[PDB]
Amino acid sequence: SHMGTIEISSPSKTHILAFPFPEKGHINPMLHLCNRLASKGFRVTLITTISTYKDVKNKILINLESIPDGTDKNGMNGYFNQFKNSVTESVAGIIEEYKLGHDFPPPKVLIYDSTMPWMLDVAHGHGILGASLFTQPCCVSVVYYHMLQIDFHREQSSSSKVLLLPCLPPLEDRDLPEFDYFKEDSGFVSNLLLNQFLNIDKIDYVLFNTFEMLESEIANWMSNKWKILTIGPTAPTAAAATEVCMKWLDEREPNSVIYVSFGSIASLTEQQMEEISQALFTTNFNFLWVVREEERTKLPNCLNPSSESFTTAAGKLGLIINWCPQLDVLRHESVACFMTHCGWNSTLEAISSGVPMICVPQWVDQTTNAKFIQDVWKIGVRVNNGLVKKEEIERCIKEVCESEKGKELKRNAMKWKDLSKEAVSEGGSSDTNLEYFASTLLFY
C-alpha cells in the first residue's frame, strides 16, 4: 500500500484522427463531431484533401492536416480507383508520423467516412481502431444493406412495385434510392453505397449522424444486428448557438423567406432552373437562393456575378448568392421554409432548426429522404415530377407557407427540433452514445 506507479488514461492524452469524404455534406458532420470530441478534452486531428482544406480551416481546438486530392476533377470509375490509392497511402503516412512523434499522443482510432470502407483496413493495418461514420439516416442505409444481401430491379413501365422491408414503411418505386440517374455509372455509384456494409462486422464503432427518436423502429432493428451508435445531430443545437446573407435576412420580416438550395453537388438542367425561377419570382414570399458559380450559366437569360438582388413580380425581395452558412440561415427567424434536394446533411440540419421543407430530390438517398420527410416525420411536402413544373413548385410553396396544413408541418418540425435537442443534451440517447464511444476509447 506504499510505492508504485499509477498510469492514467484520459481524453487529454488520447488522439483521435478523423477523415471525411471530400464533399461538404460529408465534411460538415465530421467537423461538428470533431468539435464535440475536442470539447470532451480529446486531442483531435482532422485530415482532409487540399482542395477542401481552406473551407475546413475557416469553420474551425482541432489539429488540421492536409493530403493530396488524389484525383483530377475531369470518368467516375477512374476518379475512384486513383482516389482510393492516393488517400490510403497519405493517411497511412499521417498515422505513422503521429505514432512516432512527441507533440501529440499516438493515434488511438481513425474515424473515416462510411463510403470509404477500405480505410478500416488502413486503421487495423496500423494497429489502431476504426470508426465508420455514416452520414446518412438509418432508414436509407438499411435499404443499401438489403440490396447488398430481394429483387431491386424495376421495369415500372409495365406495372408498379411496392417494397416491404422490416421496420420500414412500404416503399414505392419513387421512394427507393435513385441510381438510374447516373446512366452508365449506375452500377458504380450503387456499389459505392452498398459497399459501406462489406466489412460491417469488423468495424470497431459504427457511428450514425441521426438520433434514436427520429428512427426508433429501424435504429433498434439495426442495434440488434450491430451495435450501432446514433450520435446525431453532430451540429450544435440552436439553443446552444457568412455575413452577406445574415445582413439581408436581418432586414426581412419573420417567417417571410423561402430558403432555396440544392446542395454543392447537384446540377439541374436549364429548363429545371427556369421552372424554379418563375415560381420564385411570383410567390407571396421573399427568397434566398444559393446557386453555385458553375451553376449560374444555367439560370434563365433574363436574370458571372457572385450575387444578385431582386424585387419580384409580387413585390417581394430575393437574393441569389454563391454560398451561405446554411445552419445559421436555417436558424434565422426570417426563414419560413426550405426548398431542398433532401441530401441527408441538409435534411438533418433543417430538422435541428425546425424548418419545414419542399422536397425536390434528385438522386441516391434524396428520394428516400423525401419519402420520410413527407410521410413519416411529416415536416414537408414532396414535388411530383423528370421536370417539375412551375405550377407544381408553386403548389407546394402555397401548401407549406400559406395553408393550415403548412401550420401543422411547422408544428411537427418544431416538435422534431426539440427532440433533436433532447438527443444531444445531457441524458439524451446521442449524448449517451457519443460518451460510450469516447469512454471506451480510454479502456481499449
Notes on the structure:
There is one protein chain. The chain is an alpha/beta fold and 444 residues long. The chain folds into two domains: 11-237 and 422-443, Rossmann fold, CATH 3.40.50.2000; 243-421, Rossmann fold, CATH 3.40.50. The chain has 16 helices and 16 strands. It has helices spanning 24-39, 50-59, 76-100, 119-125, 138-148, 186-194, 216-225, 244-250, 270-280, 293-296, 326-330, 344-351, 365-376, 390-401, 404-424, 429-443, and strands at residues 15-19, 43-49, 63-67, 107-113, 129-134, 162-163, 171-172, 205-208, 228-230, 257-261, 286-290, 307-311, 317-321, 335-340, 357-359, 380-382. A seven-stranded parallel beta sheet has the order 3-2-1-4-5-8-9, with helices on both faces. Strands 12-13-11-10-14-15-16 form a seven-stranded mixed beta sheet, sandwiched between helices. The radius of gyration is 22 Å and the shape is globular. The PDB classes it as transferase. The entry lists the keywords Apo, Glycosyltransferase. The assembly is monomeric.
Number of separate strands: 16
How does the major sheet shape up? 7 strands, parallel
Strand order of the largest sheet: 3-2-1-4-5-8-9
Roughly how much helix do the residues carry, as a percent range? 40-55%
Radius of gyration: 22 Å
Beta content comes to 15-25%
Cα distance spanning the termini? 27 Å
Discrete helix count: 16
Task: Look at the structure and give the CATH class of the largest domain.
Answer: Alpha Beta
Estimated structural class: alpha/beta
Q: Globular, elongated, flat, extended or rod-shaped: what is the shape?
A: globular
Within the CATH hierarchy, at the fold level, what is the topology of the largest domain? Rossmann fold
* CATH arch. level architecture of the largest domain: 3-Layer(aba) Sandwich
| CATH level-four homologous superfamily name of the largest domain | Glycogen Phosphorylase B
User: How many separate domains?
Assistant: 2
Protein name: Glycosyltransferase
EC number: 2.4.1.-
Organism: Calotropis gigantea (Giant milkweed)
Domain Glycosyltransferase N-terminal: 15-60
